[PDB]
């Protein structure tokens, strides 16, 4: 599943912001507009057993160009919150449900 970083109108959103996926399906975060963006998972809002460092960019690493991707595959079922580090305080957060 593809998830855009930034809407075509400049909004600071993941697109889609919430979606469900089967366990192990690859999620392709694709840089879109309104840079910079990145993707990290919230250690406080993932299923128990999940290590967010394995599925997160380094906070220092930013995507500044259209078409750069960050790809992950989540194997543990449950709810995960992801966020954009620069844009977390502007509400660029999302939730994926792995089922």
The residues annotated as belonging to the active site are 37, 84, 87, 92
Kindly tell me which of 40 and 50 has the beta carbon lying closer to Cu ion: 40
Omega cis (within 30) before 14 = no
Strands (E), 6-65: 14-15, 18-21, 26-31, 40-41
Site size for Cu ion, by CB under 5 A? 4
**Cα separation, 20 vs 36, whole angstroms:** 25
Kindly tell me which of 33 and 52 has the beta carbon lying closer to Cu ion: 33
84 belongs to the binding site for Cu ion (CB under 5 A): yes
The site for Cu ion (CB under 5 A) is made up of 37, 84, 87, 92
Query: Residues comprising the binding site?
Result: 37, 84, 87, 92
């Amino acid at each position: 599943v593809d998830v855009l970083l930034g809407a075509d109108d400049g909004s600071l959103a993941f697109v889609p912001s919430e979606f469900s996926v089967p366990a192990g399906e690859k999620i392709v975060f694709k840089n879109n507009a309104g840079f910079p963006h990145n993707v990290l998972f919230d250690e406080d809002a993932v299923p128990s057993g999940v290590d967010v460092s394995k599925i997160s960019m380094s906070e220092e690493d930013l995507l500044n160009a259209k078409g750069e991707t960050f790809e992950v595959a989540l194997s543990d079922k449950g709810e995960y919150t992801f966020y954009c580090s620069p844009h977390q305080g502007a509400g660029m957060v999302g939730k994926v449900i792995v089922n």
